[PDB]
Write a protein that binds this ligand. Structure first.
Ligand SMILES: Nc1nc2c(ncn2[C@@H]2O[C@H](COP(=O)(O)OP(=O)(O)O)[C@@H](O)[C@H]2O)c(=O)[nH]1
Ligand SMILES: NC(=O)c1c(F)ccc(OCc2nc3cc(Cl)cnc3s2)c1F
Length: 307
């Protein structure tokens, strides 16, 4: 299955560039921007400049109407870059002119090209002011209507995970981790035949036309490793959507030859208990003999009923 990561606007493009810098294979990066200057600096193999006649190579200067018009006019260029994709991840910062307006258009195009469409967007910091928050909210709602599943990261949550000295770029890398882990994790699920196999169809079942989603990973070792990894996987300090309310979960447990049945049940019970509703679980398991004493629990949670 073909996986594509699309950065729309300033923040989306930045997330794409920091992910390339980190290292990712089997994934195509597409950079979409009105801003020609930022595009020339993109590390993405695929670059699409939208609304060149509309903005003259500049940004959309906080007007979502410009980003929407710019993406529509370049529908053909967007389709060609997407072509072949089975799954499309659209990343954008909401609140600006480009991301807010263009990202939902890009998402609708991917969805109409038969791609499983996942949005990973940020809401602006409260310090950016009320009008920026209002425009982002309209962009978030438009994103929800265009994608299969939407993961929202309020930028204010980054202030909950930093200390007074944490560099801003390091804080931004922590938000990139949500998308990065989700992308790498899905790619791995598709590439590896697990002892209890999960494949692209299982990803579609959990993600198609769902609305809100939670994505998480937890790594743990030693005593109580399964419970610890599962609690970490469902913890959402950066996410708007919490595990509470999830009615559907795709959950995978990766472990060495020591992976016990008892601990797989302990881990699945943490997920079932945390949700508050009975969850329809799509359970997976992988035996990686290289992991030794480490256990990795991955979760994709949906069924919040809000598309
Ligand atoms: N977490 C994060 N947020 C960003 C980043 N860059 C921009 N933002 C946020 O995204 C919103 C829109 O900015 P931007 O993507 O540059 O605007 P655009 O190019 O017009 O769509 C800003 O209001 C900030 O909240 C980034 O690198 N990381
Ligand atoms: N049981 C399997 O067929 C299998 C596999 F053989 C390799 C990896 C797997 O899952 C990896 C994942 N990693 C992540 C991270 C996030 Cl943040 C969300 N979801 C996932 S799913 C699997 F489910």
């Amino acid at each position: 299955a073909t996986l594509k990561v699309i950065g729309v606007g300033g923040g989306g493009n930045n997330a794409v560039n920091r992910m390339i810098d980190h290292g990712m294979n089997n994934v195509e990066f597409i950079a979409i921007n009105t801003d020609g200057q930022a595009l020339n600096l993109s590390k993405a193999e695929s670059k699409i400049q939208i609304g060149e006649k509309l903005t003259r190579g500049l940004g959309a200067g906080a007007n979502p109407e410009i980003g929407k018009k710019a993406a529509e006019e370049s529908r053909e260029q967007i389709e060609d870059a997407i072509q072949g994709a089975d799954m499309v991840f659209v990343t954008s910062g909401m609140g600006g002119g480009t991301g807010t307006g263009a990202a939902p258009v890009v998402a609708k195009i991917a969805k109409e090209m038969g791609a499983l469409t996942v949005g990973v967007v940020t809401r602006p910091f409260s310090f950016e002011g009320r009008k920026r928050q209002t425009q982002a909210a309209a962009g978030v709602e438009a994103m929800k209507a265009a994608v299969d599943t939407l993961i929202v990261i309020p930028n204010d949550r980054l202030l909950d995970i930093v200390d007074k000295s944490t560099p801003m770029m390091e804080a931004f890398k922590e938000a990139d981790n949500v998308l990065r882990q989700g992308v790498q994790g899905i790619s791995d699920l598709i590439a590896v035949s697990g002892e209890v196999n999960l494949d692209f169809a299982d990803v579609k079942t959990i993600m198609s036309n769902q609305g809100s989603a939670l994505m998480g990973i937890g790594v743990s070792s030693g005593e109580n490793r399964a419970v610890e990894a599962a609690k970490k996987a469902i913890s959402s300090p950066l996410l708007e959507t919490s595990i509470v309310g999830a009615q559907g979960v795709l959950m995978n447990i990766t472990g060495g030859e020591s992976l016990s049945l008892f601990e797989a049940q302990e881990a699945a019970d943490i997920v079932q208990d945390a949700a508050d509703e009975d969850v329809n679980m799509i359970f997976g398991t992988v035996i990686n003999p290289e992991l030794q004493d480490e256990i990795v629990v991955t979760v994709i949670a949906t069924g919040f009923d809000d598309k």
